Design a binder for this molecule. Structure first.
Ligand SMILES: CN(C)c1cccc(NS(=O)(=O)c2nnc(NC(=O)c3ccc4ccccc4c3)s2)c1
Ligand SMILES: Cc1cc2nc3c(=O)[nH]c(=O)nc-3n(C[C@H](O)[C@H](O)[C@H](O)COP(=O)(O)O)c2cc1C
Ligand code: SF4
Length: 363
């Protein structure tokens, strides 16, 4: 209960601790995880990606081959609404974010869906989101946070937003190459010291000075309070952490509670992705199936990302990311796809969100 970490202001919202749990798709950070995180005084973040899979397609209008048909069902408005409602049964009106990737054409529809579902903050990476305020003008209080890989992106985002909307972002998350999910770096750049998060945070904070010290949130490879203090001492206003929350009981993808305590470092690797950025995966499930020559059949049903072009890139890289992550949420160990931050192998015990926040904030 006693902490020397100070509350963090994001636009019109305040969180007791300068900690986000990063959004995790598919079905990894929904109502149980995000709700309990926000209950603890950190920012809980609901993933808006693949919400059609929620409760095995409870809220989809059409299913083909056990998959949500097209993007209107893959990004399901009614599912998102119920995930927020269920989260607020736990955290009340404590702030919640919605994470939505940029590399869908339907971006504005899902952003307004998140706003209408009750999100207080929108977080967007997997691209350069120069038009977030376009879709949010009906919701003046929702804070808007791009995820960036570099100071150059910060400067462009601020100029494009300022010129077009007379608004700048409420915060920036800078994500480094030790992160889970996709990486904002070329494969070869992920191993180079110049792009280590400790090197990126100073540059982004310095870039932020010119626009009035927009808060910078450091993400990627942050494990414990010592890493938090390191990032804060480098100018960051807070941290976003995901892999630690991936290893909590309240994670909405229950498979991880069985998979992570066995996870070995040599079984974590960067792979290709239909999204067009390197993804950090666990060497199991669909990956192993591909290497055996038993790859699941590919045929675009959910139309989940624009860069894929309805299966072109999925066929080239060998797997459909929607199908694989959805199968993991539904419990499929043989054909599911599984993601992790570089630190995933350090998960031994599965602990509660409450004990994890205690660990991260005590003192
Ligand atoms: C700022 N830029 C260019 C950039 C690039 C890469 C990473 C980052 N950093 S990041 O936005 O924090 C992210 N890390 N992982 C991400 N994964 C996803 O979006 C994702 C997860 C599951 C899906 C399932 C189905 C369809 C789409 C899916 C998309 S996004 C920034
Ligand atoms: C399993 C998993 C799934 C993720 N999926 C997403 C996602 O859908 N959208 C996103 O913006 N970030 C995603 N991320 C990135 C996290 O939100 C976060 O920025 C990053 O993992 C922080 O690094 P850490 O895991 O070392 O704390 C994912 C991370 C993990 C581990
Ligand atoms: S085939 Fe490509 S666009 Fe279609 S659902 Fe799979 S990854 Fe998404």
């Amino acid at each position: 209960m006693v902490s020397t970490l100070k509350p963090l202001k994001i636009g019109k919202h305040t969180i007791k601790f300068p900690i986000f749990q990063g959004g995790m798709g598919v079905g990894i950070s929904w109502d149980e995880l995000a709700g309990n995180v926000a209950k603890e005084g950190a920012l809980g973040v609901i993933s808006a990606v693949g919400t059609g899979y929620y409760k095995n397609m409870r809220f989809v209008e059409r299913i083909v081959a056990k998959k949500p048909f097209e993007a209107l069902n893959f990004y399901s408005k009614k599912a998102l609404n119920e995930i927020f409602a269920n989260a607020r049964k736990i955290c009340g009106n404590n702030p919640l974010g919605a994470n939505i990737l940029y590399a869908i054409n339907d971006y504005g529809r899902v952003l307004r869906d998140s706003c209408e579902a009750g999100a207080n903050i929108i977080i967007t990476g997997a691209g350069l989101p120069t038009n977030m305020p376009e879709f949010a003008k009906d919701f003046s209080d929702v804070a808007l946070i791009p995820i960036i890989s570099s100071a150059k992106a910060l400067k462009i985002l601020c100029k494009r937003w300022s010129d077009r909307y007379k608004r700048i972002p409420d915060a920036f998350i800078v994500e480094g190459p030790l992160s889970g999910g996709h990486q904002g770096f070329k494969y070869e750049d992920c191993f180079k010291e110049e792009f280590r998060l400790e090197n990126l945070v100073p540059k982004v904070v310095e870039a932020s000075k010119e626009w009035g010290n927009i808060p910078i949130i450091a993400a990627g490879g942050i494990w414990d309070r010592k890493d938090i203090d390191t990032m804060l001492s480098l100018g960051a206003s807070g941290v976003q952490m995901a892999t630690r929350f991936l290893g909590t009981k309240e994670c909405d993808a229950k498979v991880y509670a069985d998979l992570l305590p066995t996870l070995k470092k040599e079984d974590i690797l960067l792979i290709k992705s239909p999204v067009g950025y390197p993804a950090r995966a666990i060497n199991t499930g669909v990956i192993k199936r591909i290497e055996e020559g038993n790859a699941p059949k590919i045929a675009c049903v959910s139309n989940c990302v624009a860069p894929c072009n309805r299966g072109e890139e999925a066929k080239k890289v060998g797997y459909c990311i929607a199908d694989g992550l959805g199968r993991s949420y539904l419990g499929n160990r043989e054909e599911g796809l599984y993601f992790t931050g570089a630190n995933g192998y350090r998960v031994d015990k599965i602990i509660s969100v409450h004990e994890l926040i205690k660990e991260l904030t005590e003192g």
